[PDB]
Amino acid sequence: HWGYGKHNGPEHWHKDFPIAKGERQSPVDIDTHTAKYDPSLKPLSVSYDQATSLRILNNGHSFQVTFDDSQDKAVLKGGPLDGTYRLLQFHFHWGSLDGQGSEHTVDKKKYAAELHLVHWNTKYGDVGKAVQQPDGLAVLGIFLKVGSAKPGLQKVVDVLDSIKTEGKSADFTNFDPRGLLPESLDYWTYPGSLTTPPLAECVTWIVLKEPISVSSEQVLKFRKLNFNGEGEPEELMVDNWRPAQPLKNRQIKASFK
Ligand SMILES: [N]S(=O)(=O)[C][C]C1234B567B89%10B%11%12%13B85%14B%1158B%12%11%15B%139%12B%1061B%12%112C5%153B%14874
Ligand SMILES: [Zn+2]
Incomplete structure (x- = not known):
């Protein structure tokens, strides 16, 4: 039932997922002046050299590129994290x-888009178990601004015409997600949630300070996707972002001064 429209969007989700009004919901606004520099935070370790992409999929809420998470081939460690998290x-x-388009905001600024690299804690064995735990997932969030093209995004862009409508997937092998990362791994971190149903409070958020630039042509291809399935009335997949939620009793920490 849930989506991003007037009648099924974020303001409705609490009816099916009451944790929507919980104590550690995501995304949030990152107030840069209030975030505290934490000299105890480690550099983030991103080890993507052996990543194995599998498929690209439109599931009616976004598109995703899925990886082999059956071994420690593409892992996030360090930063605020204990242990090892596999890229899903x-x-x-x-x-x-x-x-508009980003979920997190920075001093209320919205970016054109936001990339989420979703990882789960290997100590829980599978993602389903991990979403039931407060330290189950680590999502690396990267802002997109519009300017110069991101060359490493183009292979993604170019296959979106083959997964237009909900329920389409395609082979998507040999994609290297290192080509989506900004220079700096400086980050903010806070405890939060999935930003889509089931809105589970299982995520350590790691939001990079440095956005990547993508071209207008690249983001326009995102906007040609459809929320609808083939044969149903065409509804552009746009504005698939949850707004900032109350910070409540949480501290955002910065890895950098
Ligand atoms: N937007 S997000 O908080 O990164 C949550 C995205 C997910 B990935 B895992 B399941 B797969 B499906 B559910 B679980 B995480 B939530 C949606 B996607
Ligand atoms: Zn997301």
Whole structure:
């Protein structure tokens, strides 16, 4: 039932998922002046050299690129994390226009899109078990602004015409997610949640300070996707972002001064 429209969007989700009004919901606004520099935070360790992408999929809420998470081939460690987190998939959230699309905001600024690289804690064995734990997932969030093209995104862009409508997938092997990362791994971190149903409070969020630039042509291809299935009335997959939620009793920590 849930989606991003008037009648099934974020303001409705608490009816099926009451944790929507919980104590550690995501995304949030990152108030940069209030975030505390924490000299105890480690550099983030991103080890993607042996990543194995499998498929690209439109599931009616975003598109995702899925990885082989049956071994420690593409792992996130360090930073605020204890232990080792396997990359399951990445996906994006984006807007109908360049002034909205991100889920996190920075001093209330919205970016055109936000990339989420979703990882789960190997100590829980599988993602389903991990989503039931407060330290089950680590999502690496990367902002997208519109300017110069991101060359490492183009292979993704170019196959979106083959997964237009909900329920389409395609082979998507040999994709290297290192080509989506900004120079700096400086980050903010806080305890939060999945930003889509089931909104489980299982995520350590790691949001990079440095956005990547993508071109207008690249983001326009995102906007040609459809929320609908083939044969149903065409509804552009745009504005698939949850707004900032109350910070409540949480501290955002910065890895950098
Ligand atoms: N937007 S997000 O918080 O990164 C949650 C995205 C997910 B990945 B795992 B299941 B797969 B399905 B559910 B679980 B995580 B939530 C949706 B996607
Ligand atoms: Zn997401």
